[PDB]
Amino acid sequence: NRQAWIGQEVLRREDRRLLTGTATFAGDLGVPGQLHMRIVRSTQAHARIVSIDATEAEKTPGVRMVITSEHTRHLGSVLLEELGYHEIYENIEDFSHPVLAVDKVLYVGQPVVAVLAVDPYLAEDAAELVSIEYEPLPVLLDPEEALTGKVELFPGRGNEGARIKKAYGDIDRAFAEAEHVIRHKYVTNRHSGVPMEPRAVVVQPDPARDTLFIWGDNRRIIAKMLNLPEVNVRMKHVEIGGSFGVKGGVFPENVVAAWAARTLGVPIKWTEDRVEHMTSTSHAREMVHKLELALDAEGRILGMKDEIFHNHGAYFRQAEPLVSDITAGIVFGPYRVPAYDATLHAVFTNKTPVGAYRAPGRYESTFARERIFDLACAEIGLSKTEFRRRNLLTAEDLPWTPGLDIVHEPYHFDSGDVVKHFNEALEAANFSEWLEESKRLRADGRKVGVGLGVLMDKAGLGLFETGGVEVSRAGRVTVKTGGSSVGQGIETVLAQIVAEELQIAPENIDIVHSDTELIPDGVGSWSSRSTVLAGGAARKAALAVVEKARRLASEMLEADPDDLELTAGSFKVKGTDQQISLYEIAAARDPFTARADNDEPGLAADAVYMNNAMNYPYGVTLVQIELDPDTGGHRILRFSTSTEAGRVINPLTTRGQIIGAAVQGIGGALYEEFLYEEDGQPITTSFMDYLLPSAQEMPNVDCFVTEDAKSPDNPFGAKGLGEIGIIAAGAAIASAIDDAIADGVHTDRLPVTPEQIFSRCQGLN
Amino acid sequence: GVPMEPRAVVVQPDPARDTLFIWGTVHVHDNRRIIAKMLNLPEVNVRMKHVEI
Amino acid sequence: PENIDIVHSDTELIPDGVGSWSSRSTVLAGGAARKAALAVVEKARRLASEMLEADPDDLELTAGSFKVKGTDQQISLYEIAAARDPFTARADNDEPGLAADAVYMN
Amino acid sequence: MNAFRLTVEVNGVTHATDVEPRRLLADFLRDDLHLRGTRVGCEHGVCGSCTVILDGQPVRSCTVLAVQANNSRIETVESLQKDGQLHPLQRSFSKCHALQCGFCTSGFLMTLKPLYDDEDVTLDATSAREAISGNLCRCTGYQQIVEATVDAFHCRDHND
Amino acid sequence: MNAFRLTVEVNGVTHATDVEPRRLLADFLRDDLHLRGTRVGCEHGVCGSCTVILDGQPVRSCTVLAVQANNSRIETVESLQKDGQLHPLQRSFSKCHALQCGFCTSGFLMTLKPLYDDEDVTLDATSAREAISGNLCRCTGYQQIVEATVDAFHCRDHND
Amino acid sequence: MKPPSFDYVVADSVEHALRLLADGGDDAKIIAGGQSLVPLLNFRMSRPSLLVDINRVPGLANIRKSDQTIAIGALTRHAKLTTSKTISQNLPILSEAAAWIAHPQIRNRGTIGGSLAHADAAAELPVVLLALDAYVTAQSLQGERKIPLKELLVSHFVSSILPGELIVEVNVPQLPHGSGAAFDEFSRRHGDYAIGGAASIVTLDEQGKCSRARITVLGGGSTAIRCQEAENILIDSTLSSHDIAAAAHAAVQGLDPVPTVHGSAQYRAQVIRTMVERTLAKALHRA
Ligand SMILES: Cc1cc2nc3c(=O)[nH]c(=O)nc-3n(C[C@H](O)[C@H](O)[C@H](O)COP(=O)(O)OP(=O)(O)OC[C@H]3O[C@@H](n4cnc5c(N)ncnc54)[C@H](O)[C@@H]3O)c2cc1C
Ligand SMILES: Nc1ccn([C@@H]2O[C@H](COP(=O)(O)OP(=O)(O)OC[C@H]3Oc4nc5nc(N)nc(O)c5nc4C(S)=C3S)[C@@H](O)[C@H]2O)c(=O)n1
Ligand code: FES
Ligand code: FES
Ligand code: FES
Ligand code: FES
Ligand SMILES: [Mo]
Predict the structure, then answer these.
(1) DSSP F99
(2) Residues in contact with A219: Cβ distance below 8 Å, sequence separation at least 6, in sequence order
(3) Do strands F135-139 and D57-60 pair parallel, antiparallel, or not at all (unpaired)?
(4) Which domain of life is it from (chain C)?
(5) Contact F44/A753, CB-based, under 8 Å?
(6) Which of A569, A571, D22, D79 is surrounded by the fewest CB atoms within 10 Å?
(7) CA torsion through residues E141, E146, E149, E152, sign
(8) Residue E138 is nearest to which of B2, B52, B53, comparing CB atoms?
(9) What is the rounded distance in angstroms from the CA atom of residue F71 to the CA atom of residue F135?
């Protein structure tokens, strides 16, 4: 008894909305009297301006207004980042547009002028007729060239970013006290999420002395910039079709809409062009890694070291530089790392401003390490596999409060690896491995590679996440959460968590989120967070309603008692002779002096909050590629990513996340890169140039490989999972490829083009 | 009473079925309580919106 | 009273209310507004004594702001609220009511 | 600038309306026909979501001007469910968790529809992958979609 | 069968649109010229709210087919306010609590407007009552409106 | 995303169509499938005055074994080219070559006529048809021209059709009883526009000798390219792996590929390939 919901494969709740076409997306929304906004974007990567005032735009009948920087710059001021640490240097500098520039332009894609028309067709029609005068300026593109003069983006003193360092232990005496010392410079891609739904915003004003309705919890910024609070929100629920952390938080488009909607009293709608997306929204992944590694004759780590240059694009969106702070923290992953120097540069170039793409800073760092490792396993010749076996964790030496300035991720305080044992994962997660080894039977199959992933999932986040549970009348329960449905099946995970604690089928739980009128406060869903956090809320609330019932349903009948048999949906009393249902309690107590539910997280002293939650997941990725030595095409024959994580709330949907995440990473490993011509012009703007993975190329195979080892210290002990699938997809492919020629682990620059696989007969000469 | 504004109602359903929006003027606009019970879809999910009367 | 806006009949913000009939809404809903505004003054004046370091006695205390002493310094009523951000909390009141109700008119 | 009188049968329902020629079929179907089921992701016949049944053949609602559909039958993801019941494809798509966001669902489902309704062929994992390949997704890795389609075709044919 | 093209000036902005002849001016001035300011209470030239300025003369937007208003200047309650500053009539109406609900406010205000703008006459309580009499209110009743109008005409003329 | 404004007229027949655009006119364009024109409009990369939808003209989607040739109407979808008369060791090669064109949903509305008059440097049908020594009859108001495929293909996105002059039919020399035909293509993603690809056909003299062979190239210059002198290397030969490799090595030496984000100049040319080598290989198998 009764049965269990948590840990069970339950068909998710969001499905039916999306399958039938009942599901509303921001772009689907229509409002009478609408103005369609088209934004005139930059065509120069770097330039000052002498804009026209169309005129010839405003002249075209059906055009109501054209917004220049004249309007938006007074005000609100520049976009406003977030909490609340990191205020240790002083930006602006950036944020982004902000909100429209009539001084300098800093990337092709930057919003300059917005038009407002009756239909979206007349919008783009008239936006063309706008003419902007430009004076080109020296174009920055390389992260290294960025910091060493001579060209500048913020011509004051600024001038090019933030410097983030972390160190402790003696790095150098470890480097002095070592035989073998290893060096190399790795360079990583520029991707983003590129989800299937482009950005979209609809704003409806209540022009009568009131508010704004917004469809598309960071109300907080818009409210502030417009000086419109007390909110006065009013963010409305719409389903989202892929964030991957790209859709982030506040954009320039977000605030222009609100301003214009406010100062006109006219419904304003904006839906993004795909070409716009590829040039306007959160870029990521672009990092350079200098890496020094010290070794004893045994081959254990004595310390890591060197510089990282993050190409933040042109401005500071979100992350701010949360990502850049995180990256400098966890380049060491899951290892014995006595000491290291980690110094990071957040730099700017004339490119689309950077946000937090799925596992930001983890794909990037995880590459550089598992590639500086394969290289030591080349230079000492010791086996690539048992290097990691010799040299990951301290099985016994846990808690492991790290060496260097750590944890500081992003901050306060500690931290360490208390999550389960590392290796008997790597050990046990080798179903199929060593017979995947038996190659070539002299052939053309060539590849085998490994990658490892710790994740600062958890990112408390934090400190809290609101929740709430309502049982009432008609046989259903309504759960309010601070989180957001983005596609990960959050509305289901909670539905299980609640159902388990409430003794009622999940087909009866409905979940409400992201309706700010209903939910006055909450954090979103970031760095693999909410299941522990927003689930811990739902538990706390569902644990409160049961005490509201099983103590004030004690009085509705006799007696205290207090009793055997706690629940089967109701409460049979002191034996199996009959009872009060759980809905009947709720049905009784509404006009009679009180209200029949709970939103226990939380009060002035917070709740639910799982506090600086550490909670580091971990695993391996295993890859076997086949190469065609000329053509340089490839067929990934076998793929299996591994993960140890807490309890795993739903096996079915967790599998989706893991598999899904990997394909994004594999896409990043061999398909996706934002390319730019010498003058800063973006090249990969359509879909034919930016290659997303398709059905045929991807492995028919992806092995779910999850293990429930020691649970952390956050109830029902769980972990973040929606970001671990991707982590190592870079490092494993690259090592697999270099094993696949061979001539040894000497690949740096990602992705891996077939033209690069033209080492073909430079293998014969 | 014969007031100047005659009676008027507007209902928009969220076919995601979760909810229902009523810019109708039902005069205790907190008597969704009746409509809820009647329709057997209670009790939030019948979210009432403010209008002038 | 210019700076004050009033929201009503929007059951997402207001999950529970009685309504308006039989010449009532002032002592009832105005009586609600009172002990709400009287819940902030404690939530605020208490919270303001912690913000500076002076205990809850001062000058007599209205601007709306907070004059301790006579006549050095001051903390406005809005800055108090703006300060209670995501610092572990929340800067508001809604005390009517619970089990054994509120407002109480019987 | 002179509107064209269009006549189209959508999901059995006939329609008569003036449209300007330049309006894309996708935008016509969404507005004012208010079937948001059809979704738009790319803008040049790639993303997939775009996809609709035109006269029995799956085509992109986004590389076709609305005016080009005059006197023709069109079906969207809205037409699948009949009388509360989800059409087998949708049912198995949920059974295998073949969707996450929602976007790449109209596209795939409508591509698969005429293939389903016609008596051949089987769809095995390999031939299944090639079928959906005309549609892109950024969430599932197709693995489950490929698994989802296959399931739909087994309860279809070899049914017990 | 029959569409009609309107060329009407409304509150300054000229509009061109095709409307079916039977649509009443009131309905036209609220859709799709979303100027909800004009309000509709009775349905036969009585309630008052209905009232709009047509070509300088106050007429009921409700006993006039929208089509009859072609090539004419029309003004509604939206047109009083000029850059934030409420038109004095609106001010004295609030200064004297001449309105409680809102409905009988477009009607009266628009009735009083051309009377105001033209240099004559004074409006004393007796002549004030006769002026507004073409509009009904169920809330005031009139005492304060009559008091409101008079006030508006004193700051107008003798004015310190 | 949104197109510019333009006018639209449904063509009832060939002549009536040819008339409709002429007086249109000047920069009036015809529209069949839409699959290249409509995307261009969405990018506002072509702004015509009026469109003439020939897509409903009744006598233009035919397939015919006519005489010594095979007749194909201009409105013939690629979708049909995959599943058709295409039998008899006279496939002859098309359904394999038309199979590489994107995805079913595009193939379902695309037409052979338009695909030619558009003529992308990576358009597949031209490459494979030039290997079949194609013959396009482009009827216009004044007369009826017949353009060999060597002359039709001018440049990237450019054909030898004077404004007007609508492609009506495509004819092909039937070939060869008996012979072998194969087409292959390389692209980072299947169905995408290729980096490099080849179309080669060989006819064999009883038993092992060869009598005639024709070879073409995708991604060569701005158009499909005859490898004429590589063909002479093949002809009269044993067809070993010593003449195929030699033919291919000489089937490339004259090319000027244009670099792309996916392709370096020499790579592209070096990816003209072994597309030749394995296409010639697959041409021969008892075929
Ligand atoms: C995602 C995607 C991938 C694609 N991949 C490929 C590919 O790999 N290879 C490939 O070859 N194509 C590809 N195409 C498109 C390709 O151009 C189509 O096969 C072709 O456009 C079919 O449509 P159509 O011939 O009717 O020309 P449409 O553009 O559909 O119709 C109008 C076009 O016909 C042209 N035209 C001019 N004169 C005539 C005439 N006399 N008769 C008929 N039409 C004429 C016009 O120039 C105009 O461009 C792809 C398209 C998309 C959206
Ligand atoms: N069915 C599930 C879903 C999630 N989780 C885990 O529990 C937490 C609940 O999810 P959430 O708090 O939303 O995690 P994130 O905020 O990090 O978002 C999920 C993750 O993975 C994603 N999956 C996505 N899937 C779809 N279809 N669309 C997106 O936009 C998605 N965006 C994301 C993004 S962003 C990330 S980073 C996550 O740590 C996740 O790892 C789980 O155990 N079981
Ligand atoms: S978006 Fe129109 S076809 Fe993919
Ligand atoms: S869930 Fe985002 S596309 Fe499938
Ligand atoms: S309703 Fe038209 S005048 Fe009263
Ligand atoms: S009409 Fe109700 S207040 Fe005057
Ligand atoms: Mo994320």
Answers:
(1) G
(2) A231, A233, A235, A516
(3) unpaired
(4) Bacteria
(5) no
(6) A569
(7) negative
(8) B2
(9) 10
Among A119, F33, D36, residue whose Cα is nearest residue D52 = D36
E strands within A557-618?
A: 597-598
Other Cβ atoms less than 10 A from the Cβ of A605: the count is 8
Residues, chain D? 160
E106-117 vs E143-154: helix crossing angle, rounded to 10: 30
**Roughly what angle, to the nearest 10 degrees, separates helices D143-154 and D106-117?**
30
Beta-carbon contacts of residue C82 (< 8 Å; ≥ 6 apart): C91
Ligand 2 pocket mutation pick from A243, A457, A488 by most atoms within 8 angstroms of CB: A488
- CA-based nearest distance D85→chain A, Å: 10
Distance (Å, whole) CA F239 – CA F210: 8
Ligand 5 nearest atom to the CA of residue E43, by list position: 1
Euclidean distance between CA atoms A222 and D110, whole angstroms: 40
- Residue linked to tokens 């569902």: A542
Tokens read off for A162 = 């933030």
- Dig out the tokens for A205 from the structure: 């004003």
Experimental method: X-ray
* A590 upstream amide cis, omega within 30 of 0: no
Tell me, in angstroms, the distance from the centre of ligand 6 to residue E98's CA.
9
Query: Between the CA of residue A421 and those of A393, A397, A400, A617, F258, what are the distances in Å?
Result: 8, 10, 11, 11, 54
Pairing of strands E73-75, A162-165: unpaired
Of D97, D130, D144, the CB nearest to A696: D130
CA C23 – CA C30 distance, rounded (Å): 12
CB distance A327 to ligand 2 below 6 Å? no
Question: Which residues, in sequence order, are CB contacts of D93 under 8 Å at separation 6+?
Answer: A15, A19, D99, D105, D109, D145, D148, D152
Strands (E), F35-140: 50-53, 63-64, 69-73, 135-139
Within C14-106, where are the H helices? 25, 31-51, 77-83
Token digits of residue E126: 């007796």
Owner of token pair 């440097």: F121
Confirm or reject: Cβ of F130 under 6 Å from ligand 1.
Answer: no
Handedness of CA F92, F96, F97, F99 (dihedral sign): positive
In 3D, which of D108, D45, B35 has the Cα closest to residue F102? D45
List the single residue in C5, C12, C99 with the smallest CB-CB distance to A593: C99
Chains B and F physically touch (3 or more Cβ atom pairs below 8 Å): no
Q: How far apart are CA C63 and CA C73, in angstroms?
A: 13
- 3-class secondary structure, D66: helix
Indicate the residue type of A528. S
Q: Is E115 in the pocket of ligand 5 (CB under 6 A)?
A: no
Per-residue CA distances from F167 to F8, F25, F97, F160, F163 (Å)? 20, 18, 21, 11, 11
Q: Which residue has the tokens 């072998």?
A: F180
Q: Residue A501: which residues within 8 A CB-CB, separation 6 or more?
A: A539, A542, A543, A546
Retrieve residue A551's tokens.
């103590």
The 10 Å CB-count burial string (b at 16+, else e) for D104-128 is: bbbbbbbbbbebbeeeeeebeeeeb
First to last CA, chain E: 61
- Domain layout of chain F by residue ranges: 1-57, 58-175, 176-287
Residue labelled with tokens 């103005």: A35
Using DSSP bridges, classify how beta strands A476-481 and A509-513 pair: parallel, antiparallel or unpaired: parallel
